[PDB]
Every structure is written in C-alpha cells, then in structure tokens.
C-alpha cells in the first residue's frame, strides 16, 4: 500500500525526481495522494483525465512497474539530453525518470514508428506526453522539424496531437509546458506511437490488478 507524502499521483507515476521513489519497494497494493503535495510536475504542464486515473488507481489491489521500451533502444534520436533545471536530481538537470524526452540527433528527428504489445497477463497503464515549446527557435532547436505531431493508437484510442508553440509565464524557470496522457492496455492489445517531434515517450509502465474478478 502506498500513500504519498511529497508527491502527486501524476508526479510519482511519471517519476518526478524531486519525489521519494521508494526504490526498495517493487510492488504495491493501491496509491492515494494527499491534499497539497509539495511536488507535482517538475516541468510544468497538465495531466489529462486525472480524476478518472486517481479514481481507478484507488480501486487497484496490485501495482508493479515494468520497463516496456528501453531508453537504450533509441538509436537515431537523442535519449540523454532531454533534461531541465526544472527537474533536478541531486541538483543536476534531470527529468521524469519513467519517460524519455526525445531530442533530435545530428540535426535530424526522423519519424518515429513504435508499437508495444501488452503480452503480460495484467492490464498495463501506459503514460506519454507532448512538449509545447515557448517559441519556434526552441521548436527547431529541440526537434529540428518545425511542424510536428504525435499520433497514438490502440484498439479504442485514436489520438492525434499537434504542439502549440506559445510563451507562458515561467514555472520552475520554464515558459514552455507539457501535456501528459495515459491509457490502459488490456492483455494482448497493442499501442502504436508515431511522431516527428515533441514526443515524451514511455520507458516504464505499470501492471495493475483491480480487486476481485
């Protein structure tokens, strides 16, 4: 059983490095955050359909993080430079540890086409995100391509997103924003990711079991 002290459910699921990780505990029963967590999204933004997720995750009886897409699998996109002083780890610029902020590599961001099949026998909660940069210079600095999209499909999901380029008030130094999404893959369903920029890719996901059944 995990009740969170310093962290929102969203921040903990994504791996906000400012939050206690409990590296010694690999499994849990259920998760519930408290009223005013000190840490939410170190890089500022919005977690979509958050109340439905919290409602679901309070009803779970088993919960276990697994790696589904290794960070080292990214060979033509930079998987190490996507960090920010907004997300410090031991003081150094870092990021949510359970996703990967993919960056262009050799001044190119080729189109990503990636699929993941939940061959486990439990439901799998999968998280991803999109980066909305502050201006066009940052858009091409990070992703090369000026005009980008993120396309996510399952058997029941068919989402296509375009980033908004807009300057926002600084939160933790950041005038950009990120938007995070989640879905539940049933056993043997697949998820498909396609993007030519601004994609915050899964690395880790969560096997979940709902009480009874």
């Amino acid at each position, epitope marked *: 059983p995990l009740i969170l002290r310093d962290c929102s459910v969203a921040g903990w699921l994504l791996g906000n490095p400012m939050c206690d990780e409990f590296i010694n505990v690999p499994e849990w029963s259920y998760i519930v955050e408290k009223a005013s967590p000190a840490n939410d999204l170190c890089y500022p933004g919005n977690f979509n359909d958050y109340e439905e997720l919290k409602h679901l995750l309070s009803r779970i009886n088993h919960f276990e993080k*697994i*790696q*589904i897409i290794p960070k080292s699998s990214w060979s033509n996109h930079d998987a190490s430079s996507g960090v920010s002083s907004a997300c410090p780890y031991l003081g150094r610029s870092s990021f949510f540890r359970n996703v990967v902020w993919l960056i262009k590599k050799n001044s190119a961001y080729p189109t990503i086409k990636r*699929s993941y099949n939940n061959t486990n026998q439990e439901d799998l909660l999968v998280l991803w995100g999109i980066h909305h940069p502050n201006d066009a210079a940052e858009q091409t600095k990070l992703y090369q391509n000026p005009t980008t999209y993120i396309s996510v*499909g399952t058997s029941t999901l068919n989402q296509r997103l375009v980033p908004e380029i807009a300057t926002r008030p600084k939160v933790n130094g950041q005038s950009g924003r990120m938007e995070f999404f989640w879905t539940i893959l049933k056993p043997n369903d697949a998820i498909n990711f396609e993007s030519n920029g601004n994609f915050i890719a899964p690395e880790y996901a969560y096997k979940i079991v709902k009480k009874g059944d």
Partner: antibody
Framework: VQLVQSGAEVKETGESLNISCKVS????????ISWVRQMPGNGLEWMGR????????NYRPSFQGHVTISADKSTSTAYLQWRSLKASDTAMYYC???????????????????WGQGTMVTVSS | EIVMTQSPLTLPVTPGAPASISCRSS???????????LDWYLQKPGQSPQLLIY???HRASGVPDRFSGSGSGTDFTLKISRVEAEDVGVYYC????????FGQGTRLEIKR
C-alpha cells in the same frame, strides 16, 4: 493475420502489370510490407517496402525505375507495378510483413514473421 | 549493401545428427540497442520462406526448439540439434540492419 497475394499471371514484354498483397485483419498496428523477388532456381532479393497506412515507400535503388510500389490504405493492400515488363521480370514475387514491436518487459520483436503465398509472373508471348 | 556469405552452400547431414550453418556479413550487424539485426529463414520445397530466428538468437513462435541461432558482429551460426526429414529445404540468413540483404542460401541434404 495473413498476406493474400493475387493469382499467377502471364503478360508480354512491354505490357503493364500490377500484382497485389492484401493484409487481412484491421492492419493495427500497420507494418511495412516488403516485396521480394525469387528468380527461377535462385535466391531472394529485396525490392522495396511500403507502409500501407501512409504509403511511406523505400526502394532498392537497383529496382527503382523499372518497378513501382504503392498501397491502398482502406483495404491495406500493397502493390508491385510494372509499366513495361521485360523477360527478366519472369519470377516469383513474395510479399512479407516486418513486424516490429516491443512486448512483455521491454523485449523486442523484429522479423518477417508473415509471408504471402507468392505470385508467379511469366513474361511471354 | 551488406554482403552475406553462407557456408556451406550444400549441407549433407546424417538423419538425427546435429548440423550447423555459418553466415558472415561484410560489416557488423550489432546495433546500438544491443541487438544483432540478423534473421534466418527456411524455404521448404514449393513453399514461401518462413521465419526461424530473429535478432540473431531469438527463436520464433512455433519453430521447433531443435533450431537455434548464435553469433555476434559479423559471425553467425544456425544450429540444428537433431536434423529431421521435415527440415529439408534451403536456409537463408538475412541482415536487417540496413535494407535487407539475404545470403545465397544453404541446401540441406539428408543422408538416409
């Protein structure tokens, strides 16, 4: 999932030909379909591939120009097309699906896991 | 192009005995993700090619466990632990690091 190829054909040198490879199912997820040539008695030669969902197409440069590859998204059917056949186009043509996906706890699958039954092309008068 | 070289091109083996087919590439097939991008296919007489091994050493579903693949870099081996009658056909390795190139193919001969 099955790849269903169109029937065997005979055409004369200089005539047009279009052969098809249909991905059964909903084609989700959509994978690249490769075309492979086998000359009589010979080995396998990769010609090109296409993702039927967006028609992104890669050609082996040695085959490009003589043959074109296209796709129809709604039916998820790939095509190999000749404008003017030569006798050296007489061959068996296979299509193949390149399933590429992560699974389990971060394991990876990358292979031609499903193959069509082959389409025999005879170029003759 | 990556030149794929198979040896031998014709492989006679005693029924029930082990067999081994070597495949060498002109350039390393080890990718930065840690995998070797090398496949083995079997084409039985009159049939389409079928997948045996993928990513160098991973046996495809429904393939008898008598088949296995090994190697790394430029040196790869398909091993058949016990050669059965139903294994006759031509065996191909294929690099998938670039656009595919197949080896020439190895014909398996059963010395009944």
């Amino acid at each position: 999932v099955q790849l269903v190829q169109s029937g065997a054909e005979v055409k004369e040198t200089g005539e047009s030909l279009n052969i098809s490879c249909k991905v059964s199912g909903n084609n989700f997820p959509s994978y690249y379909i490769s075309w492979v040539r086998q000359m009589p008695g010979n080995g396998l030669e990769w010609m090109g591939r296409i993702d039927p969902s967006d028609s992104d197409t890669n050609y082996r440069p040695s085959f490009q120009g003589h043959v074109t590859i296209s796709a129809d998204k709604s039916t998820s059917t790939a095509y190999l097309q000749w404008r003017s056949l030569k006798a050296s186009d007489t061959a068996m043509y296979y299509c193949a699906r390149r399933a590429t996906y992560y699974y389990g706890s971060g394991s990876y699958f990358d292979a031609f896991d499903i193959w069509g039954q082959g389409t025999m092309v005879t170029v003759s008068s | 192009e990556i030149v794929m070289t198979q040896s031998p091109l014709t492989l006679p083996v005693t029924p029930g005995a082990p067999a081994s087919i070597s495949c060498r590439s002109s350039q390393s097939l080890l990718h930065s993700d840690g995998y070797n991008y090398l496949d083995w296919y079997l084409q039985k007489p009159g049939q389409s090619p079928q997948l045996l091994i993928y990513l160098g050493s991973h046996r495809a579903s429904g393939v008898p466990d008598r088949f296995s693949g090994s190697g790394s870099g430029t040196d790869f081996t398909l091993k058949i632990s016990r050669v059965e009658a139903e294994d006759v056909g031509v065996y191909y390795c294929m690099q998938a690091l670039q656009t595919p190139d197949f080896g020439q193919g190895t014909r398996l001969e059963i010395k009944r």
